[PDB]
């Protein structure tokens, strides 16, 4: 029984936009939960936020989490942008809504409930679970069944 909740995530997309999917591994309580779903029209960035959202949202109490991902988009969001965006009412310098604001807000709310330690791995030097996430993400992208409702070529 691990003392820290462990989460691994990855997202894939075949176009911009294109069919895509995500893979997330969660080690909580005594289980290993695997989440994966494919969406008909989406982006790689949206899938990599979705992966994180789905796993965090599975936790029903406040926890100590270690989240591992090679996603540069999540990393940049987390370490360079989120703080600025909150201060600015989730707007860009030109006063428009941030792209993927729907997912960033959704993720932020899930993050707000836990104590998080981020582990930014390099693509070629992940753990076995990061590789399995990639495989899941790719597999779901080829068999899309959901609609990515917050997607817009727009804002």
List strands and helices in order, with pairings.
Blueprint: E1 5-13, E2 18-28, E3 31-42, H1 44-56, E4 64-69, H2 72-87, H3 101-111, E5 115-120, H4 128-141
Helix pairs in contact: 1-3
Structure description:
The chain has 155 residues and is α/β, with parallel strands linked by helices. Helices cover 35% and strands 28% of the residues. It is built from 4 helices and 5 strands. It has a 5-stranded mixed β-sheet. Helix 1 (44-56) runs parallel beside helix 3. The termini are far apart. The relative contact order is 0.26.
Supply database-style keywords.
155 residues; alpha/beta; Nucleotidyltransferase, domain 5; five-stranded mixed β-sheet; 5 strands; 28% strand; hydrolase(endoribonuclease)
Under CATH, the homologous superfamily reads Ribonuclease H-like superfamily/Ribonuclease H
Task: Domain count, please report it.
Answer: 1
Report helical residue fraction: 25-40%
**Helical stretch tally:** 4
Shape: globular
Q: What is the correct CATH architecture?
A: 2-Layer Sandwich
**Main sheet specs:** 5 strands, mixed
Estimated share of beta-strand residues: 25-35%
Structural class: alpha/beta
Amino- and carboxy-terminal Cα gap: 44 Å
Give Rg in angstroms. Answer: 15 Å
DSSP, total strands: 5
CATH topology: Nucleotidyltransferase, domain 5
**What is the element string, with H for helices and E for strands?**
EEEHEHHEH
